[PDB]
Amino acid sequence: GTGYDLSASTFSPDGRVFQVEYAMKAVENSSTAIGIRCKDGVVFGVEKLVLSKLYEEGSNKRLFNVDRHVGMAVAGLLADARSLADIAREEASNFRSNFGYNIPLKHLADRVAMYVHAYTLYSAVRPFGCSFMLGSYSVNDGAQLYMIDPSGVSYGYWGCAIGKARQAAKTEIEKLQMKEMTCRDIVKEVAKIIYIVHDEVKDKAFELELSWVGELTNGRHEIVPKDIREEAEKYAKE
Amino acid sequence: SIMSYNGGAVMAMKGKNCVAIAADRRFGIQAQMVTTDFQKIFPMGDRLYIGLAGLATDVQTVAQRLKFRLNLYELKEGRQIKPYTLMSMVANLLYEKRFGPYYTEPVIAGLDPKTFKPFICSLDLIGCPMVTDDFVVSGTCAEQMYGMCESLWEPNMDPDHLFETISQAMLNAVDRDAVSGMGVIVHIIEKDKITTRTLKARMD
Amino acid sequence: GFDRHITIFSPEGRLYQVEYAFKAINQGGLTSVAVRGKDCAVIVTQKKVPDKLLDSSTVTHLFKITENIGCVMTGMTADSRSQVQRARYEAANWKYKYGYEIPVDMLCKRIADISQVYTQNAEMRPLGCCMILIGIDEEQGPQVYKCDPAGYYCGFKATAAGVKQTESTSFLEKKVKKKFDWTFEQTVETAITCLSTVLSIDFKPSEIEVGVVTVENPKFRILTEAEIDAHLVALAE
Amino acid sequence: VQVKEQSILELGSLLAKTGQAAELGGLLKYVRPFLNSISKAKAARLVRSLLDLFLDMEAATGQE
Amino acid sequence: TTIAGVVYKDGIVLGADTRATEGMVVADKNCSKIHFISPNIYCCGAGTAADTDMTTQLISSNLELHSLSTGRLPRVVTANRMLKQMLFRYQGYIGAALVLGGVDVTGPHLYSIYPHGSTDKLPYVTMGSGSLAAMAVFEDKFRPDMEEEEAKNLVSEAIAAGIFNDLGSGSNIDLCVISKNKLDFLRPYTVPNKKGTRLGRYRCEKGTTAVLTEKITPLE
Amino acid sequence: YDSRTTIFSPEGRLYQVEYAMEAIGHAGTCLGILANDGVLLAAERRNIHKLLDEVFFSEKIYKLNEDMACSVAGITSDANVLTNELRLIAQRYLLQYQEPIPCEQLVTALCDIKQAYTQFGGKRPFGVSLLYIGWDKHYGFQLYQSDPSGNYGGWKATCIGNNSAAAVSMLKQDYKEGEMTLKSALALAIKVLNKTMDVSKLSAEKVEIATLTRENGKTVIRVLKQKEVEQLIKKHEEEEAKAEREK
Amino acid sequence: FSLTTFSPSGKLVQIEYALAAVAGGAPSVGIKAANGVVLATEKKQKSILYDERSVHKVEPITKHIGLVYSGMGPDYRVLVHRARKLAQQYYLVYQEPIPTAQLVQRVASVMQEYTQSGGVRPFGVSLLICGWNEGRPYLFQSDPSGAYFAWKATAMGKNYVNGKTFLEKRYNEDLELEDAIHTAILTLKESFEGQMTEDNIEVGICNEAGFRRLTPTEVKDYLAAI
Structure with missing residues (x-):
């Protein structure tokens, strides 16, 4: 503390970077998220606090489309999250322009994690206050899902959660048996887990932003049709 | 052509423990002479001289820049320049302007500060060194100096006969060319003295 | 003050920032062992996987920088990946500028020079990750080197990095002092028993990931579950 | 050029092995030009080694 | 200018003429067209002499620095790559045609470097204005895995043919033979062209060459 | 109170610059005395450890141009770069005008660069x-003293060393313009150096002196070697002995 | 700021701390003899795990320029690389x-x-x-x-x-x-604590013929009879 947690370039006496240790606290404080790799795809899901009913239908959505087959579910400081999503979109576009075809998810996650590490390495710039999952599917490489901490590195996840209640979500995620369940029931189950996570116990009403990618969508990461997934929300309510 | 814009003819030859550098003293545009006392032989040291041939403006610019670099190097080191090192410095200075070359063909003539070993070399416009032990020349009529030297030069020559041979070659060459002449300056460098002579030349 | 806050020389005549980064390598809870043998060099590090929701396929700390050089990383994972990317870029750039493949010692020297530039100046900070890189080199046999956050690139025969690196180095010093060369069975077994004595869990053949570079067979073999299980069975026999 | 001093060392070793005293004494008195032609330390230690070997076995207390 | 090289059994033999001409007039009769790079590799030059000299000196300096940094012997492939990058960066403005030869830990190598940056590895290489004659001599009298003396003789024959069949080349033969353990420069190896003696004392004694004025500045 | 270099004081003083200039008095000792047909510099060799070889041939005295020479009295790290820049400026003027640079112009350029260094930026x-001692066509022999503040001065007898006050007092007491010659300037310089250096009978090794003289249309800057310096010391010792005994 | 800095009134405190740091612990003696110069240093590696033929303390900058150094070896690598380039x-x-x-x-x-x-x-x-x-x-x-x-x-x-x-x-x-x-x-x-050996001591010699880092064979030969 004191003089060591002032700039990211200052190492702790024990050998730690306290700026990122505090940036992780913003992710821990912001709303939670969940992403599950189904048998033939990856299903996302994020609850979003409607801080006031003055807002329209779900805006500043935690889900983003960084590429044609790749989607990003982010939590934490949302402005820097959107800036990082723009960075990821630019990286995917550059890779498609240079090497053709579609950017593999592992390489995209590695590059964006390296960019985040570059931002947390120096002193003038500050570490990003956001953690996100990158999910994509392809016929060749199946379904992948990588999660990036505000300072850490991408890690392969069968199913991951980040935000306010990580352990509470992860317990039921590990309770759920993935790797053999189709993405439909996985949408139902991610909605169920999010509603199991507390929504109105001490906060306002929450909206359910759920994303899709898989062979059922032949790649092409898109937001699940909310009109037909309201019944999945109803099953989650029960 | 361009190298023959202002004329010029510079000679350098080797004797026995002595060197000799000579050059015409004519400056002028294509056809006319402007002055008969133009300087093309410049002393880089007590026993080391340089001769330049080409555009007179490029002659003076190369001389001034080389003097600047040489003075800086002498101040940095404190020991006198070796003629091989100065030829190298000239070569680098010329090559620094590879695509904008100074249209000059410098030659080096002098003695080692300690061993008193004669050293004569020539350089092209780009800066290729041509180190030999008999003679080098430059200018519009370099072929004439070659033709004269290939029969008037003798190895291990006394400084007096070296001066006689260099004077004969320069006078005949500036007589047989159309752009250079009207006076020949010659410097004889020995281990202890410098002999500067202005030859009796056809002023036309 | 700020002697211990920025990369500046201390009044006592020391550099505290890199001294803190070296302990940052200890932070993270991991260890690695590198053993050079008669003809091969093997590196093994534990694979600490919390919960199975992670993909054990990609949680590794060892990578292929080029076709013949493999590294293992100890410390913070972000800086580790950044230095791995830098090493791969350096190897590719060396192969482009110079036809022959980059020697492992030269790659370690370049990485250590980058780290020394990092500990120089004050705008940036040193990367808290210690890299041990191995590779077969002609006219040199197996070669193992370590580049640290300071920039001191060295290490040979038996070298370890991590939290309990001192105990592993002591045991490997005892082993190398025992004058007997290790073939391509004894080197791997020596590394495995070193890491097992450091952290006594009997090393179920899923929590470690060993990289091997031999002379007759080049390339950085990341040995699979079957190979590590066979080596463990042979050792515990 | 240093092979000669190797021969001197080789000769001294055999003289010590056999136990010769007069021959070793003559050799020590003869090698002085070679002692003052090489490195001072190397010549000095060669002198010490030859002297110690000479004083080892043959106990000429009136001559040592 | 005529330079050539061959890969013999134990290494490389390089040959070159020593005629540096300005246009159509001979300027240098002993111009060293074989340039040292590293104690195991040499390289012959052709084309613009100044550009060739500067390029080869830069490559030699960089490769000496590289060898000092690595602590090992340098490699012919590395020198080729450096030369190719440097020349292709300038897109042939460096009018330098080079013949690189050397001995590495992987075996002797011989390469041809073109001003535009083209390179290739060949058992025998010829370059320069009179390159055609030396290439023909090789094609007629080349045998793979040919011994040291025979390789030297073949290179000498090719250089001599280039000298006597190209007017802008010759006046000496410069040779270098290199192997795993031998680096031997030969300088003038054979002088097939000797200047005839000057008949009569064609010299000028003192008293002639009337001088207008003379200045004497004695030194220490 | 001190801070980043480009500051002032509540009174309005540049206390960083003043502190640096006072620190210049600490360590090093050089003095310059100007006389007719020759101006000379005297320098005190600080470290005379027997383990040196004295191959640089000059430590305090630096030849900066054909017609001038300087002597630093500050930290050597800045002294080297300042001498290099001064030589570069002199040679640039020589290239531009094809004429030796006047001493005042050179000193003004150097003090301008020092004023810039103390003026702008966090440097x-x-x-x-x-x-500086030198000769020119306009003013002949000249002597100049420049401080880190960038405010040079045209002096004729000055010292810049540790006991600079004592040395300048000794100069003022025993300085006579006009009558001064090169030999008398040498005698005065050796005497004042003996005064400012506590150990009497100064060795020729601990004192380095250089004299600039005007030969026939050419400036010669000769550094006095050991034998000539100790001969001057012997003559000074004879003078001191005669003066002391004649009382 | 971005240069050599931190010079208070009459002092170079940062430079003085650098000089305290270079006090080090590696003697690295140097002797200028009539024929040439000898630069000898101590390579006291921690334990036997480290190697002595891998890293060197004496570096030939060019044909006959040899270099030995003191504390802060990683800085010395960059410094010797810069010296070689210069x-x-x-x-x-x-x-x-x-x-x-x-x-x-x-x-x-x-x-x-x-x-x-x-x-x-x-x-x-x-x-x-x-x-x-x-x-x-x-x-x-x-x-x-x-x-x-x-x-x-x-x-x-x-x-x-x-x-x-x-x-x-x-x-x-x-x-x-x-x-x-x-x-x-x-x-x-x-300034040595131990039985110095050929790999423990690294020395380079620079005579009129050139510079050469003495191999462990000659280092052991000289260390013999000491």
């Missing part, structure tokens, strides 16, 4: 003050 | 002078990027330079902030004071032949 002032 | 650039500019001893003074002078442009944090290594391409040898020392000193015999280790005292008492002298390396090893012995 340290050049902690070095140096003398 | 010497190579000088040799390329002034082509073919075989510049070693007419360059040793020059390369020491161009060791101004070494400290006069410190780079925020000054270098923490003092280095000794040897060169003999002038008919005479040269030994120079560049410190973390100063410049060439032109030593004849000195040490830059933890016991550099007593090492220099041993050098002067043992009379480094002027008539000493090239084999003053024995005296250099003896001076190391005073």
Whole structure:
């Protein structure tokens, strides 16, 4: 503390970077998220606090489309999250322009994690206050899902959660048996887990932003049709 | 052509423990002479001289820049320049302007500060060194100096006969060319003295 | 003050920032062992996987920088990946500028020079990750080197990095002092028993990931579950 | 050029092995030009080694 | 200018003429067209002499620095790559045609470097204005895995043919033979062209060459 | 109170610059005395450890141009770069005008660069003050003293060393313009150096002196070697002995 | 700020801390003999795990310039790389002078990027330079902030004071032949704690023929009969 947690370039006496240790606290404080790799795809899901009913239908959505087959579910400081999503979109576009075809998810996650590490390495710039999952599917490489901490590195996840209640979500995620369940029931189950996570116990009403990618969508990461997934929300309510 | 814009003819030859550098003293545009006392032989040291041939403006610019670099190097080191090192410095200075070359063909003539070993070399416009032990020349009529030297030069020559041979070659060459002449300056460098002579030349 | 806050020389005549980064390598809870043998060099590090929701396929700390050089990383994972990317870029750039493949010692020297530039100046900070890189080199046999956050690139025969690196180095010093060369069975077994004595869990053949570079067979073999299980069975026999 | 001093060392070793005293004494008195032609330390230690070997076995207390 | 090289059994033999001409007039009769790079590799030059000299000196300096940094012997492939990058960066403005030869830990190598940056590895290489004659001599009298003396003789024959069949080349033969353990420069190896003696004392004694004025500045 | 270099004081003083200039007095000792047909510099060799070889041939005295020479009295790190820049400026003027640079112009350029260093940016002032002796066509022999503040001065007898006050007092007491010659200037310089150096009978090794003289249309800057210096010391010792005994 | 900095009234505090750091613990003695210069240092590796033929303390900058150093070895690597580049650039500019001893003074002078442009944090290594391409040898020392000193015999280790005292008492002298390396090893012995061996001691010699880092064979040969 004191003089060591002032700039990211200052190492702790024990050998730690306290700026990122505090940036992780913003992710821990912001709303939670969940992403599950189904048998033939990856299903996302994020609850979003409607801080006031003055807002329209779900805006500043935690889900983003960084590429044609790749989607990003982010939590934490949302402005820097959107800036990082723009960075990821630019990286995917550059890779498609240079090497053709579609950017593999592992390489995209590695590059964006390296960019985040570059931002947390120096002193003038500050570490990003956001953690996100990158999910994509392809016929060749199946379904992948990588999660990036505000300072850490991408890690392969069968199913991951980040935000306010990580352990509470992860317990039921590990309770759920993935790797053999189709993405439909996985949408139902991610909605169920999010509603199991507390929504109105001490906060306002929450909206359910759920994303899709898989062979059922032949790649092409898109937001699940909310009109037909309201019944999945109803099953989650029960 | 361009190298023959202002004329010029510079000679350098080797004797026995002595060197000799000579050059015409004519400056002028294509056809006319402007002055008969133009300087093309410049002393880089007590026993080391340089001769330049080409555009007179490029002659003076190369001389001034080389003097600047040489003075800086002498101040940095404190020991006198070796003629091989100065030829190298000239070569680098010329090559620094590879695509904008100074249209000059410098030659080096002098003695080692300690061993008193004669050293004569020539350089092209780009800066290729041509180190030999008999003679080098430059200018519009370099072929004439070659033709004269290939029969008037003798190895291990006394400084007096070296001066006689260099004077004969320069006078005949500036007589047989159309752009250079009207006076020949010659410097004889020995281990202890410098002999500067202005030859009796056809002023036309 | 700020002697211990920025990369500046201390009044006592020391550099505290890199001294803190070296302990940052200890932070993270991991260890690695590198053993050079008669003809091969093997590196093994534990694979600490919390919960199975992670993909054990990609949680590794060892990578292929080029076709013949493999590294293992100890410390913070972000800086580790950044230095791995830098090493791969350096190897590719060396192969482009110079036809022959980059020697492992030269790659370690370049990485250590980058780290020394990092500990120089004050705008940036040193990367808290210690890299041990191995590779077969002609006219040199197996070669193992370590580049640290300071920039001191060295290490040979038996070298370890991590939290309990001192105990592993002591045991490997005892082993190398025992004058007997290790073939391509004894080197791997020596590394495995070193890491097992450091952290006594009997090393179920899923929590470690060993990289091997031999002379007759080049390339950085990341040995699979079957190979590590066979080596463990042979050792515990 | 240093092979000669190797021969001197080789000769001294055999003289010590056999136990010769007069021959070793003559050799020590003869090698002085070679002692003052090489490195001072190397010549000095060669002198010490030859002297110690000479004083080892043959106990000429009136001559040592 | 005529330079050539061959890969013999134990290494490389390089040959070159020593005629540096300005246009159509001979300027240098002993111009060293074989340039040292590293104690195991040499390289012959052709084309613009100044550009060739500067390029080869830069490559030699960089490769000496590289060898000092690595602590090992340098490699012919590395020198080729450096030369190719440097020349292709300038897109042939460096009018330098080079013949690189050397001995590495992987075996002797011989390469041809073109001003535009083209390179290739060949058992025998010829370059320069009179390159055609030396290439023909090789094609007629080349045998793979040919011994040291025979390789030297073949290179000498090719250089001599280039000298006597190209007017802008010759006046000496410069040779270098290199192997795993031998680096031997030969300088003038054979002088097939000797200047005839000057008949009569064609010299000028003192008293002639009337001088207008003379200045004497004695030194220490 | 001190801070980043480009500051002032509540009174309005540049206390960083003043501190640096006072620190120049600490360590090093050089003095310059101007006389007719020759101006000379005297320098005190600080470290005379027997383990040196004295191959640089000059430590305090630096030849900066054909017609001038300087002597630094500050930290050597800035002294080297300042001497290099001064030689570069002199040779640039020589290239531009094809004429030796006047001493005043050279000193003004150097003090301008020092004023710039102490003026703008977060850069340290050049902690070095140096003398200059030289000859020109306009003013003949000249002597100048420049401080790290960038405010040079045209002097004729000055010292810049540790006991600079004592040395300048000794100069003022025993300085006579007009009557002064090169030999008398040598005698005065050796006497004042003996005064400012506590150990009497100064060795020729601990004192380095250089004299600039005007030969026939050419400036010669000769550094006095050991034998000539100790001969001057012997003559000075004879003078001191005669003066002391004649009372 | 971004240069050599932190100079209060009458002091160079940051430079003084750098000089305290370069006190180090590696003696790295240097002796300028009549025939040449010997730079000998101590390689006391921690345990036997480290190697001695892998990393070196003596680096040949060019044909006859050898270099030995002091504390902060990682800084020394960058410094010697810069010195090699600078010497190579000088040799390329002034082509073919075989510049070693007419360059040793020059390369020491161009060791101004070494400290006069410190780079925020000054270098923490003092280095000794040897060169003999002038008919005479040269030994120079560049410190973390100063410049060439032109030593004849000195040490830059933890016991550099007593090492220099041993050098002067043992009379480094002027008539000493090239084999003053024995005296250099003896001076190391005073600042050495152990039975020094061929791999434990690294020494390079620079004579008029050139510079050469002595292999462990000759180092052990010299260490024999000591």
